[PDB]
């Protein structure tokens, strides 16, 4: 692979290291990801290849899939910053509401597109939401989870974050639905608003109990079928639900109403991306430009 000159290490992903690189022939600047192997599953090659056709303005474009020497490389369009860094850089003053709303609106458009094509992300987090100088925000790594799997540690034994995982996944449900992505985005929306993670669990049970402490321990009334989930235990403590006004102050009622629908326990009652786009919170949406210092 001498068709690319590594410019720097953009980081270490869940599957492999990611590099910023320039195509020696085209001059194009791209993001190159080396994927974890002994023969490379043929099942994963066809799945990944299908994603090359999943193109939308709010989805990071997958340019090419290169298979070789027990090694798989994914070539993606390059963006200069991620939302995790932007939030840290905006920690003192906070991201202005108009920009938070623009970003949430664009992310829901991207989810609506992928979900209409039967593609789920499964591991949304600030680190895989990328931004540019024009005020655009895009989702990175859609569909890779299903193509492969989701280990506990990265290739460098790094600890995978559980902060954005939906309760049905934590309770052992075997079949994920588009609803898991809406839950993760709701958690990110709350974090942009308050400037602190909503549910920063440091273990699977701590993550689950942090959710229960805030939204109340779920029961058959609010979540039909919950007591029959694979990892549900009758011994779970029973915490009362807290008021949203206390969860994401000082967000207005339009915002709290939308957030509450994105965080419904029952995956079937949780709002869809398409329906969320029509919520009154977006009546005055615009597209501001962020101040990025690259
Ligand atoms: N597609 C990409 O461009 C990308 C891929 C993986 C991780 C971060 C990424 N960009 C944002 C970024 C963050 C830090 C430094 N330079 C770029």
UniProtKB/Swiss-Prot annotation:
Its EC number is 2.7.11.22. Binds 2 Mg(2+) ions. GO terms for molecular function: ATP binding; cyclin binding; cyclin-dependent protein kinase activity; cyclin-dependent protein serine/threonine kinase activity; magnesium ion binding; protein domain specific binding; protein serine kinase activity; protein serine/threonine kinase activity. Residues 4-282 form the Protein kinase domain. The record marks 9, 84-85, 162 as: CDK7 binding. It is an enzyme of class 2 (transferase). Its main location: cytoplasm. Keywords: Acetylation, ATP-binding, Cell cycle, Cell division, Cytoplasm, Cytoskeleton, DNA damage, DNA repair, Endosome, Kinase, Magnesium, Meiosis, Metal-binding, Mitosis, Nucleotide-binding, Nucleus, Phosphoprotein, S-nitrosylation, Serine/threonine-protein kinase, Transferase. Its cofactor is Mg(2+). The modification N-acetylmethionine is found at residue 1. It catalyses: L-seryl-[protein] + ATP = O-phospho-L-seryl-[protein] + ADP + H(+); L-threonyl-[protein] + ATP = O-phospho-L-threonyl-[protein] + ADP + H(+). Phosphorylated at Thr-156 by CDK7 in a CAK complex. Phosphorylation at Thr-156 promotes kinase activity, whereas phosphorylation at Tyr-15 by WEE1 reduces slightly kinase activity. Phosphorylated on Thr-14 and Tyr-15 during S and G2 phases before being dephosphorylated by CDC25A. The modification Phosphothreonine is found at residues 14, 156. Mg(2+) binds at residues 128, 141. The modification Phosphotyrosine is found at residues 15, 19. It comes from the Eukaryota. Found in a complex with CABLES1, CCNA1 and CCNE1. Interacts with CABLES1. Interacts with UHRF2. Part of a complex consisting of UHRF2, CDK2 and CCNE1. Interacts with the Speedy/Ringo proteins SPDYA and SPDYC. Interaction with SPDYA promotes kinase activation via a conformation change that alleviates obstruction of the substrate-binding cleft by the T-loop. Found in a complex with both SPDYA and CDKN1B/KIP1. Binds to RB1 and CDK7. PANTHER family: CELL DIVISION PROTEIN KINASE, CYCLIN-DEPENDENT KINASE 2. Serine/threonine-protein kinase involved in the control of the cell cycle; essential for meiosis, but dispensable for mitosis. Phosphorylates CABLES1, CTNNB1, CDK2AP2, ERCC6, NBN, USP37, p53/TP53, NPM1, CDK7, RB1, BRCA2, MYC, NPAT, EZH2. Triggers duplication of centrosomes and DNA. This is Cyclin-dependent kinase 2. It comes from Homo sapiens (Human).
């Amino acid at each position: 692979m001498e068709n690319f000159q590594k410019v720097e290490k953009i980081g270490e992903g869940t599957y492999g290291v990611v590099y910023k690189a320039r195509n020696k022939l085209t001059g194009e600047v791209v993001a190159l990801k080396k994927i974890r192997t002994e023969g490379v599953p043929s099942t994963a090659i066809r799945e990944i290849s299908l994603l090359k056709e999943l193109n939308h303005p709010n989805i990071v474009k997958l340019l090419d899939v290169i298979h070789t020497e027990n090694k798989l490389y994914l070539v993606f369009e390059f963006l200069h910053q991620d939302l995790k860094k932007f939030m840290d850089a905006s920690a003192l003053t906070g991201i202005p509401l108009p920009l938070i709303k623009s970003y949430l609106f664009q992310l829901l458009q991207g989810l609506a597109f992928c979900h209409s094509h039967r593609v789920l992300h499964r591991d949304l987090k600030p680190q895989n939401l990328l931004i540019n100088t024009e005020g655009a925000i895009k989702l990175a790594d859609f569909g890779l989870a299903r193509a492969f799997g989701v280990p506990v540690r990265t290739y460098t034994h790094e600890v995978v974050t559980l902060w954005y995982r939906a309760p049905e996944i934590l309770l052992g449900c075997k079949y994920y639905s588009t609803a898991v992505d809406i839950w993760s985005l709701g958690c990110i929306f709350a974090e942009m608003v308050t400037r602190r993670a909503l549910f920063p669990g440091d273990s699977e049970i701590d993550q689950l109990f942090r959710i229960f402490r805030t939204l109340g321990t779920p029961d058959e009334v609010v979540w039909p079928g919950v007591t029959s989930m694979p990892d549900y235990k009758p011994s779970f403590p029973k915490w009362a639900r807290q008021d949203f006004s206390k969860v994401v102050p000082p967000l207005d009622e339009d915002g709290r109403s939308l957030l509450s629908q994105m965080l419904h326990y029952d995956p079937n009652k949780r709002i869809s991306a398409k329906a969320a786009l029509a919520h009154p919170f977006f009546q005055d949406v615009t597209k501001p430009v962020p101040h990025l210092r690259l």
